Structure formats: structure tokens, C-alpha cells
Design a protein around this ligand. Sequence first.
Ligand SMILES: COc1ccc([C@@H]2C(C#N)=C(N)OC3=C2C(=O)C[C@@H](c2cccc4ccccc24)C3)cc1
Ligand SMILES: COc1ccc([C@@H]2C(C#N)=C(N)OC3=C2C(=O)C[C@@H](c2cccc4ccccc24)C3)cc1
Ligand SMILES: COc1ccc([C@@H]2C(C#N)=C(N)OC3=C2C(=O)C[C@@H](c2cccc4ccccc24)C3)cc1
Ligand SMILES: N[C@H](C(=O)O)[C@H](OCc1cccc(NC(=O)c2ccc(C(F)(F)F)cc2)c1)C(=O)O
Ligand SMILES: N[C@H](C(=O)O)[C@H](OCc1cccc(NC(=O)c2ccc(C(F)(F)F)cc2)c1)C(=O)O
Ligand SMILES: N[C@H](C(=O)O)[C@H](OCc1cccc(NC(=O)c2ccc(C(F)(F)F)cc2)c1)C(=O)O
Lengths: 397, 397, 397
Amino acid sequence: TKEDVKSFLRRNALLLLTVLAVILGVVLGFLLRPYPLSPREVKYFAFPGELLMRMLKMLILPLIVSSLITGLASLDAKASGRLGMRAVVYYMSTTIIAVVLGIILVLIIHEVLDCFLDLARNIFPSNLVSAAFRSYSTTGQEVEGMNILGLVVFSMVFGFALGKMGEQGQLLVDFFNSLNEATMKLVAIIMWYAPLGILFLIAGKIVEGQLGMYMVTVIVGLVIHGLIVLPLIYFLITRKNPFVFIAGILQALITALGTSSSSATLPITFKCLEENNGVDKRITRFVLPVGATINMDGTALYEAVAAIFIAQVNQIITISITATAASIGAAGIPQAGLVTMVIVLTAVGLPTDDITLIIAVDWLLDRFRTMVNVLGDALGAGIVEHLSRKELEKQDA
Amino acid sequence: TKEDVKSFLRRNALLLLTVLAVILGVVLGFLLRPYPLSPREVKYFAFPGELLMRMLKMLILPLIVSSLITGLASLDAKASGRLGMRAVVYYMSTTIIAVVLGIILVLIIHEVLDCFLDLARNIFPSNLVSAAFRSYSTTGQEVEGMNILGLVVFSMVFGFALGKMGEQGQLLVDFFNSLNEATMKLVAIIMWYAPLGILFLIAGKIVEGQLGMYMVTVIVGLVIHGLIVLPLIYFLITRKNPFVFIAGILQALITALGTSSSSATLPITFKCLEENNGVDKRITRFVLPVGATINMDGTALYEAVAAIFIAQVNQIITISITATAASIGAAGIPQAGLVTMVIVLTAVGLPTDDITLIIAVDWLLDRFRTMVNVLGDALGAGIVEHLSRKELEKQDA
Amino acid sequence: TKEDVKSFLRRNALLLLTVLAVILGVVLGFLLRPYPLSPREVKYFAFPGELLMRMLKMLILPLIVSSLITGLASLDAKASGRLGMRAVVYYMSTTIIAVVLGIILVLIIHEVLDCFLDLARNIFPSNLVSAAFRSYSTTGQEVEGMNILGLVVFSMVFGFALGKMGEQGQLLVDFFNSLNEATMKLVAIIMWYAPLGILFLIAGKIVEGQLGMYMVTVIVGLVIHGLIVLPLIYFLITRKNPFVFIAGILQALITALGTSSSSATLPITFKCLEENNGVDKRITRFVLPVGATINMDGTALYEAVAAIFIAQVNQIITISITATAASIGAAGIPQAGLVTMVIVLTAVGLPTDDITLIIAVDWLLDRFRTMVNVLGDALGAGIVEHLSRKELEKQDA
Ligand SMILES: COc1ccc([C@@H]2C(C#N)=C(N)OC3=C2C(=O)C[C@@H](c2cccc4ccccc24)C3)cc1
Ligand SMILES: COc1ccc([C@@H]2C(C#N)=C(N)OC3=C2C(=O)C[C@@H](c2cccc4ccccc24)C3)cc1
Ligand SMILES: COc1ccc([C@@H]2C(C#N)=C(N)OC3=C2C(=O)C[C@@H](c2cccc4ccccc24)C3)cc1
Ligand SMILES: N[C@H](C(=O)O)[C@H](OCc1cccc(NC(=O)c2ccc(C(F)(F)F)cc2)c1)C(=O)O
Ligand SMILES: N[C@H](C(=O)O)[C@H](OCc1cccc(NC(=O)c2ccc(C(F)(F)F)cc2)c1)C(=O)O
Ligand SMILES: N[C@H](C(=O)O)[C@H](OCc1cccc(NC(=O)c2ccc(C(F)(F)F)cc2)c1)C(=O)O
């Protein structure tokens, strides 16, 4: 039992390094906490964690495009719809269970139109080159930050258009498969930088009562949905140990607990499922890019608790529907999850000005929130893969 | 005669739908006209027509690039110059007849240097990625809106550079031919959205004497050049019925009567000539992208009438040359045709401040103006195709 | 001797034309010098030289990307490191000899932290499409002008990732080799415009004591390092006549003496080495893109003289290290070499406000400064090619 320890210290050496970086990140951060938290000084200390995010976000653009293009071309007309329906039924339910449990824990223990239009404006981009670095935000009208929604949508219909012309449109698919493979080699390179980054990402961010109880409500709620409810969903589908599957994607969850972005961690998550858990590439390039942008189970729970927590200052159907709708939401400027807090409160009738209270604790919750967002699509991949046994068998020979 | 009606209701079902959308567009627009024409309210009603333009303009960038690249590579050194000379002699004459007839109807019934330099600055782009979403406008110096001129020029010399290296540069040509085909599948998809868009595009834009007579001068002038002069040019070249050819490209003219942009309609025009009229792809990818940006017969007529109409408030050679030069013009910010009205009046000596009069009626004229711009290159394609009998025969085997 | 003159007037006809353009450029410039040097008037006269720079800079982006991608894929794991180590040992020494000689001639005859971070932020781009037209400059935070550093770095690791997957990643390499060849055909086209441009580039820029002696210090210093020291380095490696090699790349040096940018001239330099001097493409696509951005021997000499020249108004180790570090420097906004003058003086302790003195003469020195920057990598190519005899032999069959 205590003899086979060295065989684990050599195998998962980097997995121990990113864990030790989480340990040392708490160490160095609290060590430099008594010193002044000057804006420049903080941003200079949080620079090796900043460099990591630049390498990580540069890799997502040629990843999501090449993923969905080959992902839909390598699937039949009915096979693409089937795999999709299996994923959507999973996405909607996992964002509906997290909101239900999220509403229970808080009730037991404790322009809006222009947003709909901008999302629709972003689903159909006016320019593709622009979409690769610009999103639409009304009131000039194009804000900085890649329009992932417009790219995901275009990549799907373009990829499916290739999968409908076959022989002619094989060249482009063979181009996008080599490009997806090249960025999957680049992710193995940037993988080694992760410990040095995850350290300064959480070391630099810790140098920044009534909220005390709220913090535990969400944290425990996320543990019940993520480490209790979600593994039971996997066992109800595959009948395989999920706590061994989750172990394989640890390097992606540990980084999610640092980066706080399912986007920044999607290339590592892609490697953790294609290499460690050995999931079929045909479904990773399909489920993972969509899942990271739409399936946000960690967000659904946090949006529900925050809406009822501010009600203490002062019709659950108007809150449960909006919090599930906020999870699919990715409009305007890219943020930490506070970008959609105005929309979730206006539709019900709660005070919008009560947001400044939760922002002080939000940053530590964001790290746990992202872990569930990644765990949602990660476990979801196995569930969709197991449910698409016929579709994946027919593709070979 | 009245028995073969159902065989037309099933065949050209979408062509009847876009016509009925033009009918219902007049219906719903005038129905909601008594109500307040509030800025937000109008822009929200004109949203399903707005979404259409986003899908349409996203498709032009990978269309014009792939069109001209394969279009010049699939043609010999002399064959490219020949086909080109046939198109230029046609372009210059169709913009010279429309100005002559345009000058007759109005005379019978009724910095400028920095603009030349910006056009030249835009012919040779400083950066290609920039050119895909930015144009040059002096006084920071790069305005939003794709530099079509710089793309058309580069696409030609890049495509011809591939057509000069052959075997080596075949791979890229085979890539750009699959990409042109993929966006031609995407246009068939967006084709079905057109009725729902063309409805709200003209329904939302109708909720917005001396000019009364001017409006008819241009409208009748356009009918004489477009539906009388232009079909006679086609009959003088092909000796085939043009009123059957124009019927094939109806779905592109009906949309031009809505979108008001030969750019937005170029992907539909590409489908209407490659699928309905059965024109050779080798000349569509050649003539159509250039024709939509340079051959503007509807503009030449409107620029001539507007210049002499403002003279009523108060040397035809100084007006006839500038109005033909305004048609080739595509500099600065993309507009509705009023962007070049300062240039056409300064060179002759007419009052520039008299522009605010015609802008109120310009929007309805723009819809008819574009129809002639599309009809110019559409009929032009057949004429060039028929004139390049030897060049297209030698290319096979 | 005087009989074989016509055989040179027909062969190097364009090389005589660009030389005659340098002659006529001095002629027309001084002819129009008595007239008013109005801002607009100057910019309109310097327009045919302006058009040249637009064609030249549009060609660098698809050149450097395709160059380094095929350049590292067509080399073995150790072969890439070897060729690289040979180039780096050459780069660092040529920037160390130019600073040493630069420090001798001037001493015989006569936030800074935010700059380090921005360079590191630019080495790892956050977005690739952005990197193709945007650089990082702190205090919104992304300035206009292609991030060459981030492109050079990415192009290397992406190209090497293809060279590690072989057969799979051969398609993309065969794509990038056809694209590098296409822009090498486009450079032969733009080559003919060079005389008409180089004329108005130096004709328009000449219409714009204590500094008199400083001007000669640098000019003579550059001649000693470039036309005396550098050819001796080539003879110490190849044992071949360098004054015949330099003659082949004349059309690239003559243009450098006009454009004043090693970027703008890199496509011509690429043609002058691949066509005239007959250097192996395998090392041109390797050494040249890097060399133009990092190896700046003309800058190292000018940075050293300017730092000690301003000391006349008032520890050489603090000046010699910074001037060598300024040569590798390419951060923020693209300039004429004055962008790094604040950094080189703050680290030592010299007055930063004394910059406004040398800017009046800097423009004529810049033209000679660039010639050494181009001559550095041009001669460097031959030296690396000769030093990589084994690596280039093993690549064939
Ligand atoms: C809110 O945004 C999304 C985007 C994608 C999806 C689904 C998904 C996932 N996960 C992936 N990878 O592919 C497809 C999906 C479909 O349901 C539709 C499916 C599909 C089937 C058949 C034809 C198609 C043509 C174009 C695009 C998708 C198509 C592909 C769901 C919601
Ligand atoms: C104002 O802007 C334009 C742009 C294009 C054109 C003509 C055209 C049309 N329509 C198309 N499709 O191709 C060519 C044209 C030529 O006349 C030139 C022709 C050509 C022949 C031979 C070599 C070439 C090399 C580079 C570019 C074009 C070349 C191609 C005319 C005016
Ligand atoms: C300041 O910026 C630079 C960038 C490049 C270089 C060198 C160079 C030149 N000149 C070129 N063409 O390629 C390589 C170089 C290496 O030293 C490293 C070399 C290399 C070898 C092995 C594996 C690599 C993997 C990724 C990138 C480069 C790699 C390639 C030096 C400094
Ligand atoms: N931390 C969460 C959280 O990034 O998944 C989430 O972050 C805020 C947020 C809100 C709405 C949309 C997003 N979108 C992304 O970060 C994103 C996710 C994935 C991609 C993709 F490219 F597909 F990989 C691109 C972008 C993020 C939250 O805190 O609620
Ligand atoms: N409605 C006309 C009218 O778009 O063709 C015309 O619109 C204004 C105008 C003026 C100058 C240039 C343009 N250019 C375009 O709209 C355009 C046309 C074609 C393309 C292309 F990409 F090649 F398809 C790109 C842009 C438009 C007019 O009203 O005179
Ligand atoms: N004239 C010099 C001088 O352009 O090489 C130099 O110009 C200023 C300067 C300073 C720092 C960086 C640069 N970089 C470039 O011009 C540049 C060089 C090469 C490329 C590349 F793309 F690789 F070809 C891109 C950009 C220029 C100087 O005067 O010191």
C-alpha cells in the first residue's frame, strides 16, 4: 500500500506540481499579504500567471474552429442531430438540476431587451475576421473579445457543408484535422508552464459575517451538484466509476481553480479527455467547445443563490428560468460572471443596485464555479460517448 | 394556359415567397405607420431584416477572395486579359449609356484630392488581415468596413501568381475552390431566411411636390436603361431572350429591392446565375465580384439626375465624366450612395450644401438603383460568357 | 574593359534604375526645396513612395509566417537547434562588435519595467488574428501595428509542431510552401515599382555645427562595421569574396536606403538572396525573418553614439549592455529607432529630455542604419549556410 508511492511520483509528476503550486500559491500570497497591495505592484507579481492566460487564450481560437469543423464533417446528417440531441438534453438538465438544488440550499439554510438582441446579433456575425477578436455590444457597437458564439455557429454550418460535399470538401477537413492536432501539440508544450502560472494566478489574487454564510451556501451547493449529483448521473449512464474518470481530468480542474475561465482551460480539458480518460476525439471536438460556452452548471447554482441572498434585504419560477438562461448567456464584454446579474434580477423585480455586496467574495467562488462548468462537459462527454455507441461504430470502415 | 399554375407554385415556391414578402412588407409597414416611429422601436421591428444582412455580409468576404483566386488561376495569361478586356469594355459602356440617358431625361422633362489618394491607398492595402474589416479614410486613418477594393486587387494578383506556378500552386487553388463551394452551400441555407428578412427590411424602412417629379425622373430613367436598353444589349450579343434570363435572377433582384446593397445580394446573385441561368462558374467568379463593386449603372443614372436637379435652385462634359467616375467609386465609409455626392458637384461648381433635399427620398430610389447595379453584371455575365467561346473551350481537356 | 558595358546595362537594368532613382531623388527633392514645405503638399509629393511601403508591408505578414513555418518543419529536432545556435552566436556577436566600435569612435573623436513586461506580453500573444495587426502597449492597451515578435514565436513552435507529426502535418507545410512561393512571385511584381517609389521616398523626405560632427561619427562608424568589419567576418567563415556577395543584394540595400525599414525591405532581401546570391531557401526562411527583427547592428552603433553624444551636455558597461539590448527591442508603436531612446538613458542615468536635439538629423542616419541591419542578416545567411554543411546535406534523399 505505502510501497507503490514512487511509481505515482514519477507518473503524475506534473499533476503533483500543479497541486503543489496551489499549495505554494496560498503560501506566497499570504506571505506577501501584509505588504502594500498597490495596483502596479500586484499586476507585476501576478505577471507569470498573466503570461499563462495569454498562451491559453491564443490556443482556443484555432481549437474551437478546427474542432467543430472536423467534428461535424466526420458525422452523418442524422448522426450529427442525434449526438447533438443527446448533448442538448444533457446540457439543459444539468443546468436545471444545479438551479433546483441551488434554489433549495438558499431557501433551506439562508436594457434587458437589448441583451436578447445582441446575443442574436452575435449568433450570426456580420464579419468572420472581426468575430475572431470582436463581439457585439450595443451603445462603437463592437467590443473587444472574440465572439465565440458566432464562431461556434459558423464552424458548425461550415463543417457540416464540407460533410455534405465529401470528396471535394475532404481537403479542407484534412487541413482542419492537422491544425486541430498541431494546437494539441502546442497545448502539451504550454502544459509545463501551468504550475509556475497557477501559483502566481492564485498568489496574486488573494492579495485583494453576512457574506460569510452566503459563501458556504454556494460552495457546499456546488459540492452536492458536482461531487455527489454529477457522478451519480455518470453511474446511471455508463455504470463505471466516475471518481477515477474525474481523477484523469484533474490537471484541467486544478487549472480551472486558477484560471477561473472554462475557455482558458478548454485546451487542457481537451488534452485531459483525449489523453488521460481516452475519450473518442469524434465527440470531444463536438461536445467540449459547445459545453464550455453553454453548459455552465457552476454558474446556474451561483446565479440562483445570489438572487435569493439579496432578497434578505427586502414566484421562484421567474428566478429558476432566468438563472438557467444566464448559463447559456455569453453576450457583450467577457467577465467573471457578474455581466449577467442585471438581467436575472430585472425580469423578477429584485433590486439591481445590491450587486456591490457579493463582488468582494465572487472571485474565490468563481474558481469553484468554473470547476463545475468544466466537470459538467467533461462527465457529459463520457455520457454522450456511451449514448452514441451505434453512431461511432458505423463511422469505422 | 390556366391549368399549369400549380406546376409553378411548387417549382418557384421561394420566388413567390420573397414576392409575397415584398407585398406583406408594404402591408405591415403601412399598418404600423400611424404608431410612433421611435428610434429604438423602429430598429427592434427592423431586426429580422437586420439579421439577414449580417448572414449576407459574412458570406461576401470568403466569397470574393475564393472567387477571384480560382477565377484567375483557371484562366491562361492571355485568356485572363481577354475576358477582362471584354468585361471592362462592357463595364465602361454600360456606365456611359446610363449617364447619357440619365442626362437626357433630366434635361428634357425637368477634400476632393484626398478622395483620389484614399482610393489609391485602398487599392494597395498596407495589411491584408486589416483589409478584411478596415478601409482607409484620411482624418484614426482606418475606418470600419471591409476594404473590398484592396481584396479584389490582391485576390487577382495572388490567384494569377498561383496560375503561373501550376502544379506547386494547385493545392491552394483546390483549397479555394472547395471554400467557394462551401459558402455556395451556406448561401442556399441563408436563402430560406430571405422572405422573413426582405419583409421586415422594407416594412421597417417605410416607417421613416418638387422632389415628387425628381423621384419619377430617376425611376423611369432606370426602367429605360434597365428593362429596355440593357435587354437590347443582351439580344445584340447572344440573340437569346433576356426577359427569360432576368426571370432566372429574380430572387437576386427582389432581394436587391430589399437589401439595397449589391454586396449583400452578390452571394444570392452568384447562386441565381450558377444555378438558375446556368452560367459557367469560370466567368461568374471572374465577372460578378468585380461587377458588383465597379459596374454601377443604377448609380451613374442617379448621380447624373441629382446633379442637374439641384441646378434648378441656381458644360455637361464635367458632370457626365464625374457621374461615370462615381460608379467605380468605393472609398471611405460604406453608405447608400450619398458618400460620393460632394465629389460629383465640386469638380463642376454646383452648391454642395443642397444635398439635404434628396436624402428624404433617396432610400426608396436606392432599392431600384441597386436592381440596375445587379442587372448590369448579371446580364454582363451572359454577354462576356458568349464573347469568350474560344477561351472556355480551350480550358477543357 | 570599357567594351563589356552594354552587357551590364541590359542584365542589371533595374539595379541601375533604383540607383538612378537615388540620383534623381536628390535632384527633384532639392529642386522643390525652395518652395513651401506645407504638411499636405509634402505628403502628396511623397505619395508614390508611400504607395510602395503599403505594397511592401502587406507582403511581410504572409512572408514571415510561411517562412518560419516551413523553415522549422524542413529541419530536424537537433538541426533546428544547431542552425539556431549558429545564428544566435552570430546575432549577439555582430550586435556586440557594432556597440564596441560604436563606443570607441564617439569616445576617441567626440516606465522602464513596463517595457520589459510589454515585450514578454508580446512574445506570447493573447490572440493570433489580433497579432496580425496589433501589438501590446500598456496605458486601450493594444496599439496598431502587427506584433512581429508574437508571430515569429508562434510561427516557430507551430512549424516545429508540424515537423514533429510528419505525414499528418505535411499538408499544412505543403500549403505554407506554396504560399511562401506565391508572395515571392508578388515581390517580383512590386520590384518594378521600387524605382518610382525610392525616388519620391527620398525626394519627399529631404524637404524636411554640434550635430554636424555627430552625424559623421555614426556614418563613418557604420562604414567601419559594415563595409570593413562585416566582410572580414564573411572571409573568416566562407573564405569567399564578400564584395561580390554584397553586390548581389544591392537592390535590397538601395531600397533600405529609401524605405528605412528592414521589414519593408525583407521581401526584396528575400529575393536578393534566394535569386541573386543563390542562398539555400531552407536557411533564408529561417535566418532572414528573425534577423530583420532582432539582428540590428546599425541600431547598436547609433544607440551607443547618441547616448555618449548627449553626455557632452553633462561606467560604459551600463551603456554597452543597454544598446545591445535595444537592438533586440521591438515593443509598443513601430517607429524610426527613437522609441527605445528613453530605456537606454534611464538605466545608466543620462538626461532623457535631451532627445529633441538628434531627431532633426536622425532621418538621414536611419537610411544608413537600416543598410547595416539588412547587411547583418544578409552576410549572416551565407555564414550560417556555410556553417550548416552537414545539416543541409542530410536533408536531401
Ligand atoms: C447553443 O448552441 C448549440 C450548439 C451546438 C449544439 C449541438 C452540439 C453540442 N454540444 C454540437 N457539437 O453539434 C451540434 C449540436 C446540435 O444540436 C445541432 C447539430 C446539427 C445537426 C445537423 C445539422 C446541423 C447543421 C448545422 C449546424 C448544426 C447541425 C450539431 C447545441 C447547442
Ligand atoms: C477596377 O478593377 C478591375 C478589376 C478587374 C478587372 C477585370 C476583371 C473583371 N470584371 C476580372 N475578373 O479579372 C481581370 C480583369 C482585368 O481587366 C485584368 C485581368 C488580368 C489579366 C492578366 C494578368 C493579371 C494579373 C493580375 C491581375 C489581373 C490580371 C483580370 C477590371 C477592373
Ligand atoms: C529572439 O527570437 C529568436 C527566434 C529564433 C531564433 C533562432 C532562429 C534564427 N535566426 C530561427 N530561425 O529558428 C530557431 C532559432 C532558435 O534558436 C530556436 C530554434 C528551435 C529549435 C528546436 C526547437 C524549437 C521549437 C520551437 C521554436 C524554436 C525551436 C529555431 C533565435 C532567437
Ligand atoms: N468562470 C465561468 C466560466 O468562464 O465558465 C463564468 O465566467 C463568466 C462567463 C460568462 C459568460 C460566458 C463566458 N464564456 C467563457 O468564458 C468562454 C467559455 C468557453 C469558450 C470556448 F472557446 F468555447 F472555449 C469561450 C468563452 C464566461 C462564470 O463565472 O459564470
Ligand atoms: N446601392 C448601391 C450598391 O450597393 O450597389 C450603391 O450603394 C452605395 C455604394 C457606393 C460605393 C460602393 C459601394 N459598394 C458596395 O456596396 C459593394 C458592392 C460589392 C461588394 C462585393 F464584395 F464585391 F460583393 C462589396 C461592396 C456601395 C448606391 O446606392 O449607389
Ligand atoms: N530602421 C531600423 C529597422 O527598421 O531595421 C530601425 O527601425 C526602428 C525599429 C525599432 C525596433 C523594431 C523595428 N522593427 C522593424 O522595423 C521590423 C523588422 C522586421 C520585421 C519582419 F517582419 F520580420 F520582417 C518586422 C518589423 C524597427 C532603427 O532605425 O533602429
